[PDB]
């Protein structure tokens, strides 16, 4: 009799499971952005469906409707803060033209490669989850982080792990310890 913990699923599956043209395009998005499985594509196709739906519902309301203005702007104001919506695409008619790569572009996955730090999307992954990266003070190991506009500049190797200073790894430190004990004496 404890209050129920609410939850929701984050993704959706396609209506026709076998489509060559759709299975290729999904593979492409997988390889460009270093994705894991179709589910990660799917999760984003979902976000887009929800945002285009709320927009559609706003655009059938008369302009200068308090609800259309209040929710219209806030939708646009969040889409800009992450770098999904351009410095001006800022009308609602434009979010409706937005697509998935616009979201996929903002992955801390894709930003670690976008500025240096990686030289791969796959190098970018293994880096992130392995604890060397930081956004401000904070280590973030989630490749889905979705880097927001004004935090873009704080992304650099973490205060720990060799790539930020403060000791080398324990692979390296083992290699220093074999050169010592063996031919050193």
């Amino acid at each position: 009799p404890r209050a129920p913990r609410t939850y929701s699923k984050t993704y959706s599956t396609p209506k026709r499971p076998y489509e060559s043209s759709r299975l290729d395009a999904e593979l492409k998005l997988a390889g460009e952005f270093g994705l894991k499985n179709k589910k990660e594509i799917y999760r984003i196709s979902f976000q887009l469906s929800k945002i285009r739906r709320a927009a559609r519902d706003l655009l059938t309301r008369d302009e200068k409707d308090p609800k259309r203005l209040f929710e219209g702007n806030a939708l646009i104001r969040r889409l800009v803060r992450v770098g999904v919506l351009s410095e001006d695409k800022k009308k609602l008619d434009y979010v409706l033209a937005l697509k998935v790569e616009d979201f996929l572009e903002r992955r801390l996955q894709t930003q670690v490669y976008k500025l240096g730090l990686a030289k791969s999307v796959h190098h970018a992954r293994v880096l992130i989850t392995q604890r060397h990266i930081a956004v401000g003070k904070q280590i973030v190991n989630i490749p889905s982080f979705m880097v927001r506009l004004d935090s873009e500049k704080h992304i650099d190797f973490a205060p720990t792990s060799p790539f930020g200073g403060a000791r080398p790894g324990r692979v390296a430190r083992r290699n220093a310890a074999r050169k010592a004990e063996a031919s050193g004496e």
Partner: protein
């Protein structure tokens, strides 16, 4: 239909197929890395086309 026809022959073919052990090969990657294997293979290097861009052609052609 007649229900009492012969059960004598059950498992005939499976039993009499010559057993063949599967050959050891390298472990394929799992996860994001396998998917990377498909992308760079399926379309980057473009090593297979008749114009039909075959996925699994039979030996020779």
């Amino acid at each position: 239909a007649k229900v009492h026809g012969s059960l004598a022959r059950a498992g005939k073919v499976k039993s009499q197929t010559p057993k063949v052990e599967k050959t050891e090969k390298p472990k394929k990657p799992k996860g994001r890395a396998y998917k990377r294997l498909l992308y760079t293979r399926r379309f980057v290097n473009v090593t297979l086309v008749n114009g039909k861009r075959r996925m699994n052609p039979g030996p020779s052609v």
